[PDB]
Amino acid sequence: RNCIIGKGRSYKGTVSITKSGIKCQPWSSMIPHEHSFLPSSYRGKDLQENYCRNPRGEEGGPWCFTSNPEVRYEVCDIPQCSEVECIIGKGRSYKGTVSITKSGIKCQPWSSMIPHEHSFLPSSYRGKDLQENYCRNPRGEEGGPWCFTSNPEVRYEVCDIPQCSEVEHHHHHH
């Protein structure tokens, strides 16, 4: 993805513009800037196209030589990856803390039988993180994470959690 973890020493994404907005120079090119980061000599460091990279693992994060003759190199401005509430596909793996249904009803705790009695006991679904009153999809059903609701007239309802594809840092269409 196009965010970095730590200093991005293994960053392999597609950002190709510096912090000040300068288009990166290709690693294979000596123009404008002549240099020794030859892709054939630095394999495993994935010096591909003109993508920002951190081949030496430095504090600045990924950087590139720049297409501006007056600026030899510059760090890139790549956000640090941060956890956001989202699901992939149907949310079989969702372990977030959303606890309200799509119609805004507070979820009932999984450990509770009130108002709705049920057989989704946390002790019987070890591994599925039936914690507190958090929306979950413990049998990997279509429709996604859901909960029993605190409203006695609504036994259960799906929760509306955004798809991670809406918020993530995508590889560009290159």
Numbering used by the authors: 4 to 177
Provide the publication's sentences verbatim.
In this work, we describe the rational design, production, and characterization of K1K1, a novel minimal MET agonist consisting of two copies of the kringle 1 domain of HGF/SF in tandem orientation. On the strength of the structural, biochemical, and mutagenesis data available, we rationalized that a covalent dimer containing a tandem repeat of the K1 domain of HGF/SF could constitute a minimal and stable MET agonist able to diffuse effectively across tissue boundaries owing to the absence of the N-terminal domain of HGF/SF responsible for high-affinity binding to heparan sulphate proteoglycans (HSPG). Therefore, we designed a linker to bridge the distance between the C-terminus of the first K1 domain and the N-terminus of the second one. We chose for that purpose the four–amino acid long linker, SEVE, which is naturally present between kringle 1 and kringle 2 (K2) in HGF/SF.
